[PDB]
Amino acid sequence: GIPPKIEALPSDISIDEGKVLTVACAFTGEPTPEVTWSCGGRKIHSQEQGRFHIENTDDLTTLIIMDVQKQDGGLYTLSLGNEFGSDSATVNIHIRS
Amino acid sequence: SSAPRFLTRPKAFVVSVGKDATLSCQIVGNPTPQVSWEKDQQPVAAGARFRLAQDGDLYRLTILDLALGDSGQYVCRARNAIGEAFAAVGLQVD
């Protein structure tokens, strides 16, 4: 029994519009926690807008935003959960125009 | 031609009751990305206690003679013409 734990997530990251942004985050937990990326209470699904992609391995999750738009700026929350507990962290993503 | 990517999770290595730490990760991109480390939203610059090195796609930050003030979150930033990749790792000095 090991509750999930997010290793580290930056509080803030900046990116120029028209670029690709990737944010990778390590985690632990036994069993492997389920991974949720969300925007204001709503789970983000891989391929949304043909630009957002999420890839999860056993100890690393990656959020990919291709061709970054001004509307993409905002708070993105990573949440982890298993039978032993949950962990959650938020990154504020700022777009430079 | 391709945005940067972390092939493996950034890792912070320290021995119990140790005086030195090493932080490393494997990053790829085309063109080869410029890699830097940040702590407290300020770049980490090379000096007597902070050592930066590269060996192919593997990038390292070694911290010598650890002080309590070295504790915190280190962000690794990889950038090229196509995009940027970010990944953070924590270091707790006791």
GROMACS .gro file of C-alpha atoms in nm, chain A:
model
   97
    1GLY     CA    1   0.000   0.000   0.000
    2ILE     CA    2   0.168   0.316  -0.136
    3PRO     CA    3  -0.047   0.634  -0.186
    4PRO     CA    4   0.029   0.823  -0.512
    5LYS     CA    5   0.275   1.112  -0.513
    6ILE     CA    6   0.352   1.364  -0.790
    7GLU     CA    7   0.736   1.406  -0.795
    8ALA     CA    8   0.735   1.778  -0.897
    9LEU     CA    9   0.530   2.002  -1.127
   10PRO     CA   10   0.632   2.363  -1.208
   11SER     CA   11   0.386   2.622  -1.077
   12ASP     CA   12   0.425   2.834  -1.395
   13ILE     CA   13   0.557   2.786  -1.745
   14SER     CA   14   0.563   3.031  -2.038
   15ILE     CA   15   0.560   2.949  -2.410
   16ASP     CA   16   0.541   3.145  -2.734
   17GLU     CA   17   0.223   3.092  -2.949
   18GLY     CA   18   0.282   2.875  -3.261
   19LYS     CA   19   0.525   2.640  -3.079
   20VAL     CA   20   0.498   2.290  -2.930
   21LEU     CA   21   0.488   2.268  -2.552
   22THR     CA   22   0.554   1.949  -2.351
   23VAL     CA   23   0.533   1.918  -1.972
   24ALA     CA   24   0.654   1.588  -1.821
   25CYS     CA   25   0.582   1.480  -1.463
   26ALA     CA   26   0.707   1.174  -1.270
   27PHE     CA   27   0.500   0.994  -1.008
   28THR     CA   28   0.500   0.702  -0.765
   29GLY     CA   29   0.223   0.490  -0.611
   30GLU     CA   30   0.134   0.122  -0.556
   31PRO     CA   31  -0.071   0.010  -0.749
   32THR     CA   32  -0.002   0.239  -1.050
   33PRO     CA   33  -0.236   0.535  -0.998
   34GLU     CA   34  -0.478   0.643  -1.268
   35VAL     CA   35  -0.369   0.970  -1.428
   36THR     CA   36  -0.604   1.264  -1.493
   37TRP     CA   37  -0.509   1.593  -1.665
   38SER     CA   38  -0.786   1.850  -1.629
   39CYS     CA   39  -0.889   2.205  -1.713
   40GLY     CA   40  -1.132   2.361  -1.461
   41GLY     CA   41  -1.293   2.041  -1.333
   42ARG     CA   42  -1.302   1.871  -1.678
   43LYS     CA   43  -1.076   1.580  -1.781
   44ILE     CA   44  -0.873   1.660  -2.099
   45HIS     CA   45  -0.865   1.375  -2.351
   46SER     CA   46  -0.576   1.297  -2.578
   47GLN     CA   47  -0.622   1.445  -2.939
   48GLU     CA   48  -0.855   1.727  -2.829
   49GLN     CA   49  -0.860   2.005  -3.099
   50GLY     CA   50  -0.615   1.782  -3.293
   51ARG     CA   51  -0.340   1.947  -3.080
   52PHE     CA   52  -0.354   1.809  -2.723
   53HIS     CA   53  -0.186   1.477  -2.649
   54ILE     CA   54  -0.132   1.287  -2.325
   55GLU     CA   55   0.109   0.997  -2.286
   56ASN     CA   56   0.131   0.790  -1.971
   57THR     CA   57   0.382   0.525  -1.874
   58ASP     CA   58   0.409   0.349  -1.535
   59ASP     CA   59   0.595   0.644  -1.369
   60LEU     CA   60   0.576   0.939  -1.611
   61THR     CA   61   0.291   1.140  -1.764
   62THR     CA   62   0.340   1.393  -2.043
   63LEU     CA   63   0.103   1.675  -2.151
   64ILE     CA   64   0.169   1.786  -2.515
   65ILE     CA   65   0.017   2.093  -2.672
   66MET     CA   66   0.114   2.125  -3.039
   67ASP     CA   67   0.086   2.459  -3.223
   68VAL     CA   68   0.013   2.655  -2.902
   69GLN     CA   69  -0.274   2.909  -2.931
   70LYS     CA   70  -0.355   3.211  -2.711
   71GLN     CA   71  -0.676   3.033  -2.590
   72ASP     CA   72  -0.452   2.750  -2.448
   73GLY     CA   73  -0.328   2.970  -2.163
   74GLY     CA   74  -0.467   2.860  -1.830
   75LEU     CA   75  -0.443   2.628  -1.534
   76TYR     CA   76  -0.380   2.256  -1.604
   77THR     CA   77  -0.419   2.014  -1.315
   78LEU     CA   78  -0.258   1.674  -1.283
   79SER     CA   79  -0.438   1.434  -1.045
   80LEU     CA   80  -0.340   1.083  -0.939
   81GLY     CA   81  -0.547   0.828  -0.751
   82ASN     CA   82  -0.533   0.467  -0.623
   83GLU     CA   83  -0.692   0.273  -0.327
   84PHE     CA   84  -0.448   0.445  -0.084
   85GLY     CA   85  -0.511   0.810  -0.165
   86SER     CA   86  -0.471   1.084  -0.417
   87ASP     CA   87  -0.231   1.362  -0.512
   88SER     CA   88  -0.292   1.671  -0.724
   89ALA     CA   89  -0.087   1.963  -0.863
   90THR     CA   90  -0.150   2.256  -1.094
   91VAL     CA   91   0.062   2.434  -1.355
   92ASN     CA   92  -0.031   2.781  -1.480
   93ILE     CA   93   0.061   2.792  -1.854
   94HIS     CA   94   0.116   3.141  -1.998
   95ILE     CA   95   0.124   3.213  -2.371
   96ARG     CA   96   0.358   3.486  -2.509
   97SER     CA   97   0.215   3.672  -2.813
   0.00000   0.00000   0.00000
